[PDB]
Amino acid sequence: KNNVLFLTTSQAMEDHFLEDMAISKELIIRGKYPRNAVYGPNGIHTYDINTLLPKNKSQYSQTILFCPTYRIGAIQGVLNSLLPDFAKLEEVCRHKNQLFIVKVHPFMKKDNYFAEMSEKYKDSEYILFW
Amino acid sequence: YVGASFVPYINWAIKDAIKRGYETIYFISRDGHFLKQIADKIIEIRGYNVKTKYIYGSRKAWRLPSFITKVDDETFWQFGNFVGMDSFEDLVKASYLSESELLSLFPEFESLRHAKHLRGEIAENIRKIF
Ligand SMILES: Nc1ccn([C@@H]2O[C@H](COP(=O)(O)O)[C@@H](O)[C@H]2O)c(=O)n1
């Protein structure tokens, strides 16, 4: 309540965070999220994207980023109910030259199914666990 | 040991049933096999005026038919149906559905074929799915 400068980004978000938090309105900072306006094309880049992809990005028609959230009260089996058949997903993405990037919420990395599929497709050409 | 565990209880229950006015006492399958023997001996010795009958049934044979107009929420919780299951075919038997019907409603469960521990969080997720 005395030392927290909270970063709001819009009037709606400012009102929301004022509702849900115990911050001081006179300590609010209005601006951009740095993580949304620093790593641009000509921005900062601490790593080359190509060292993480199975192939150069040019060899992919579309780069797809699957980024779900954690479901409250469940972890084991969520990913499986969202992506039950990774084999057919790989087939489809291959036939389409699509790179499917599994980037689940950190809390979800403990789903045994997640580890199973991450090991099963660690060297996959079209399914990449980030 | 078994007398001290059963006979005082059935003596109490018979006296209390008479005191409350019950005319017929039904002992239910399995548990009632020994209890009804005890109760009959007590009633004979004491000349108690009450009839005893034996009825066959179990949680299995009675819970499902009891779903008259709704499937109880208990069915999908910790003391419900999807409990203590230690294999995929155990899930099949707990679901009431045939294997093919189960996989046809919930294809994701195909990924649980070769698992051998369907307890814990996985059971809770399966309950939420059903
Ligand atoms: N699949 C996901 C889900 C969340 N996140 C991170 O977590 C933050 C908060 O997301 P949640 O609202 O899902 O918790 C995101 O803004 C992002 O930084 C992620 O990096 N990958």
Side-chain angles (χ1 to χ4, degrees), chain A residues 35 67-70 103-105:
Chain A
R35 77 190 184 179
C67 50
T69 316
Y70 65 97
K103 167 53 175 173
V104 301
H105 188 278

Short mmCIF file of all heavy atoms in Angstrom, two decimals, chain A residues 35 67-70 103-105, ligand 1:
data_model
loop_
_atom_site.label_atom_id
_atom_site.label_comp_id
_atom_site.label_asym_id
_atom_site.label_seq_id
_atom_site.Cartn_x
_atom_site.Cartn_y
_atom_site.Cartn_z
N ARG A 35 7.29 -6.44 -21.98
CA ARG A 35 7.40 -7.71 -22.70
C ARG A 35 6.61 -7.73 -24.00
O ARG A 35 6.64 -8.75 -24.70
CB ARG A 35 6.96 -8.86 -21.79
CG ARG A 35 5.45 -9.00 -21.64
CD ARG A 35 5.11 -10.01 -20.54
NE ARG A 35 3.67 -10.23 -20.42
CZ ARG A 35 3.11 -11.06 -19.56
NH1 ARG A 35 3.83 -11.77 -18.71
NH2 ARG A 35 1.78 -11.19 -19.55
N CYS A 67 -1.18 -22.36 -26.84
CA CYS A 67 -0.82 -21.83 -25.52
C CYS A 67 -2.05 -21.82 -24.62
O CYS A 67 -2.67 -20.77 -24.41
CB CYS A 67 -0.22 -20.43 -25.65
SG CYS A 67 -1.21 -19.30 -26.66
N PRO A 68 -2.42 -22.97 -24.06
CA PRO A 68 -3.59 -23.02 -23.17
C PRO A 68 -3.25 -22.55 -21.76
O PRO A 68 -2.09 -22.39 -21.39
CB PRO A 68 -3.96 -24.51 -23.19
CG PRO A 68 -2.66 -25.20 -23.40
CD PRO A 68 -1.86 -24.30 -24.32
N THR A 69 -4.30 -22.35 -20.98
CA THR A 69 -4.19 -22.02 -19.57
C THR A 69 -4.41 -23.27 -18.72
O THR A 69 -4.88 -24.30 -19.21
CB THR A 69 -5.20 -20.94 -19.17
OG1 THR A 69 -5.22 -19.90 -20.16
CG2 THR A 69 -4.84 -20.33 -17.82
N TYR A 70 -4.07 -23.17 -17.44
CA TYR A 70 -4.35 -24.24 -16.50
C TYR A 70 -5.81 -24.17 -16.06
O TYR A 70 -6.34 -23.09 -15.78
CB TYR A 70 -3.42 -24.15 -15.29
CG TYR A 70 -3.61 -22.91 -14.44
CD1 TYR A 70 -4.39 -22.94 -13.29
CD2 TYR A 70 -2.99 -21.71 -14.78
CE1 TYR A 70 -4.57 -21.81 -12.51
CE2 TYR A 70 -3.16 -20.57 -14.00
CZ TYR A 70 -3.95 -20.63 -12.87
OH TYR A 70 -4.11 -19.50 -12.10
N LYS A 103 3.10 -24.92 -26.11
CA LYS A 103 3.60 -24.03 -25.05
C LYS A 103 2.51 -23.95 -23.98
O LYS A 103 1.73 -23.00 -23.93
CB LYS A 103 3.96 -22.65 -25.63
CG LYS A 103 4.17 -21.55 -24.59
CD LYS A 103 5.18 -21.95 -23.53
CE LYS A 103 5.46 -20.79 -22.57
NZ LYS A 103 6.32 -21.19 -21.42
N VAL A 104 2.46 -24.97 -23.13
CA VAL A 104 1.44 -25.03 -22.10
C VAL A 104 1.82 -24.11 -20.94
O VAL A 104 2.97 -23.71 -20.78
CB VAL A 104 1.21 -26.47 -21.61
CG1 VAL A 104 0.78 -27.36 -22.77
CG2 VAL A 104 2.47 -27.02 -20.95
N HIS A 105 0.83 -23.78 -20.12
CA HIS A 105 1.09 -23.01 -18.92
C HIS A 105 2.05 -23.78 -18.02
O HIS A 105 1.94 -25.01 -17.91
CB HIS A 105 -0.22 -22.71 -18.19
CG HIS A 105 -0.07 -21.76 -17.04
ND1 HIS A 105 0.36 -22.17 -15.79
CD2 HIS A 105 -0.29 -20.43 -16.95
CE1 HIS A 105 0.39 -21.12 -14.98
NE2 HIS A 105 0.00 -20.06 -15.66
N1 LIG C 1 0.34 -21.49 -22.21
C1 LIG C 1 0.82 -20.35 -21.46
C2 LIG C 1 -0.05 -19.69 -20.44
C3 LIG C 1 0.45 -18.53 -19.67
N2 LIG C 1 1.80 -18.02 -19.90
C4 LIG C 1 2.32 -16.86 -19.15
O1 LIG C 1 1.52 -16.67 -18.00
C5 LIG C 1 0.92 -15.35 -18.03
C6 LIG C 1 -0.42 -15.38 -17.35
O2 LIG C 1 -1.32 -16.26 -18.02
P1 LIG C 1 -2.57 -16.89 -17.25
O3 LIG C 1 -3.66 -15.85 -17.28
O4 LIG C 1 -3.03 -18.09 -18.03
O5 LIG C 1 -2.06 -17.36 -15.91
C7 LIG C 1 0.91 -15.01 -19.51
O6 LIG C 1 0.77 -13.62 -19.76
C8 LIG C 1 2.24 -15.58 -19.98
O7 LIG C 1 3.32 -14.73 -19.62
C9 LIG C 1 2.67 -18.67 -20.92
O8 LIG C 1 3.76 -18.26 -21.11
N3 LIG C 1 2.16 -19.84 -21.69
#
